[PDB]
């Protein structure tokens, strides 16, 4: 309990105005880890990174984006742009050679052409379709892309979820706060089909005098429905699948951030021990921030 003495010291300070000693008091609470903390933290960071990689593999057009810029630069007879560095670069457990890129993309094309018809067979939830999608995600997993392209790859999911969630909360922004339909039945009816107006006119079938006056707001409550239909038809994924994908991306990223954050303060002492030698050109506390 290193925070117990913090109460006994801060409540009885001389009100020090020196930012350096208060910063060192703040960073002195964390202790040093050795030979076990680094390994466990690195394992947690890798688990978070692999969870993030898993999240983007399920999204159907991630493969299409992995492939289409390389297809575009194929027609140039060469790939001299920096995106050749942002190739798949499969991990092994150097310059990009055609003998590797074409070999890796052959099975990618095969999966891209073989995973379409199986989805239509016995619906999206087909066992063989699901396992083939998982296999395609796995063969996508054997790649090690660059963080530059990976950044916008995950930004695509962030923006797509932002758009879909804005279209979602638009429903409460237009009707729940004004018409006041109970959410207890609304949450169950929304997940029913989310493709047609079966529950929209099922509410009309019930008494629901508030819902009876929906025609005046029909031409603005059905626009969100049409937008979410458009999102589904352009992404090729159901609402539940993307909610699961991003709800696990969220906690994978949270775990990675927590691991990196917890690792960081374990070496603030090292940062100070290095920064003290470099003063005096500029300052003493700015060097600490640069070391951080």
């Amino acid at each position: 309990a290193a925070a117990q003495v913090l109460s006994s010291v801060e409540s009885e300070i001389g009100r020090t105005t020196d930012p350096v000693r208060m910063y060192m008091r703040e960073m002195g609470t964390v202790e040093l880890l050795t030979r076990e903390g680094e390994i466990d933290i690195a394992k947690r960071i890798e688990d978070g990174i692999n969870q993030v990689q898993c999240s983007v593999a399920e999204y159907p057009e991630a493969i299409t984006y992995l492939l289409e810029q390389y297809d575009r630069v194929e027609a140039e007879e060469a790939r001299l742009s920096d995106l050749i560095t942002g190739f798949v670069d499969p991990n092994a457990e150097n310059s990009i050679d055609p003998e590797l890129a074409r070999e890796k993309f052959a099975e990618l094309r095969a999966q891209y052409v073989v995973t379409r018809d199986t989805i239509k067979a016995k619906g999206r939830s087909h066992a063989t379709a699901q396992e083939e999608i998982l296999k395609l995600s796995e063969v996508f997993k054997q790649f090690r892309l660059v963080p530059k392209q990976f950044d916008y790859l995950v930004n695509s999911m962030r923006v797509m979820m932002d758009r879909v969630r804005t279209q979602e909360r638009l429903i409460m922004k237009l009707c729940v706060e004004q018409c006041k339909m109970p959410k207890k039945n609304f949450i169950t009816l929304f997940t029913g089909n989310e493709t047609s107006d079966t529950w929209f006119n099922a509410a009309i079938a019930m008494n629901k005098p508030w819902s009876e006056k929906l025609h005046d707001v029909s031409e603005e409550v059905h626009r969100a429905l049409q937008k979410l239909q458009q999102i589904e038809e352009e992404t090729g994924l159901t609402i539940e699948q993307v909610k699961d994908i991003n709800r696990r991306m969220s906690i994978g990223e949270a775990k990675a951030r927590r691991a990196k954050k917890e690792m960081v303060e374990a070496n603030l002492r090292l940062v100070i021990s290095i920064a003290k030698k470099y003063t005096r050109g500029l300052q003493f506390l700015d060097l600490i921030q640069e070391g951080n």
Binding site: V9, G14, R15, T16, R21, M24, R25
Partner: protein, 50 residues
């Protein structure tokens, strides 16, 4: 009278109070207090009467 006003009771408390007076804000430590007190008047490098 000075003992009456004194709030401390042993050497450790006195060293902690000296450290708190000299370096407010920084939490006292078992060894830092004695190191600072020794360096105040009992180190040749950091003290000299000539």
């Amino acid at each position: 009278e000075t003992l009456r006003v004194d709030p401390t009771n042993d050497r450790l408390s006195a060293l902690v109070e000296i450290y708190r007076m000299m370096r407010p804000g920084e939490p006292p430590t078992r060894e830092a207090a004695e190191s600072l007190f020794e360096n105040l008047f009992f180190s040749e490098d950091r003290y000299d009467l000539s």
